[PDB]
């Protein structure tokens, strides 16, 4: 299987044609995506197979082949880049200044960019190219646009 670092599309042939259900990050031999993309199911990579290693429905994250490796955090001041990988379209970097989700358990960074549901799992990066979280879990505000959290896991 292809295990080179980079961003990957999560595809399925169960529905009509081939459908992109999400996106993920390959880093240090571990595939990282959002839980609602795969529902914890096994993935295929050419001839190889990736099996789930860690997952949590509340965090909305899952890792394949090993533990969660991404641990960079948003600094709270700087602009970031959503490396959006939309269905049927080429990967493109969109720069934005994140907002804030104020919760009872603290504040989380949030990106106000609207992309198809099949873009879930696309990495959000800092100026160094480090993945500070994944896109695809948030809320819908008054005007109808999407505001996603910058969802980051924990590195053991």
């Amino acid at each position: 299987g292809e295990t080179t670092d980079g961003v990957y599309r999560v595809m399925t042939r169960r529905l009509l044609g081939s459908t992109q259900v999400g996106v993920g990050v390959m880093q240090e031999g571990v595939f990282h995506t959002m839980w609602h993309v795969t529902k914890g199911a096994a993935l295929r990579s050419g001839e190889g197979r990736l099996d789930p290693y860690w997952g949590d429905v509340k965090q909305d994250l899952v890792s394949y082949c090993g533990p969660w490796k991404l641990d960079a955090a948003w600094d709270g001041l700087s602009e970031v880049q959503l490396l959006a990988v939309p269905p049927g379209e080429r990967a493109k970097n969109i720069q934005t200044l994140p907002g804030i989700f104020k919760t009872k358990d603290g504040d989380i960074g949030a990106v106000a960019l609207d992309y198809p549901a099949g873009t879930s799992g696309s990495p959000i990066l800092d100026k160094c190219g480090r993945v500070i979280g994944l896109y695809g879990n948030g809320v819908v505000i008054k005007n109808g646009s999407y505001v996603s959290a910058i969802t980051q896991g924990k590195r053991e």
Binding site: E2, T4, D5, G6, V7, Y8, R9, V10, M11, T12, R13, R14, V21, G24, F31, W35, T38, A41, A42, L43, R44, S45, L50, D56, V57, K58, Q59, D60, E79, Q81, L83, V85, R90, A91, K92, N93, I94, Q95, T96, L97, P98, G99, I100, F101, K102, T103, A110, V111, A112, L113, P123, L125, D126, C128, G129, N137, G138, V139, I141, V147
Partner: protein
Amino acid sequence: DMYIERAGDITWEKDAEVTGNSPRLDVALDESGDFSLVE
């Protein structure tokens, strides 16, 4: 059965398209991992 296809490198792009606002939202997170607007 799901499968993965490489889509690119993870790199910061200088002079990328700068868009999107920065809203400060009061949200709640339930046990199913779903966010909702607290109002």
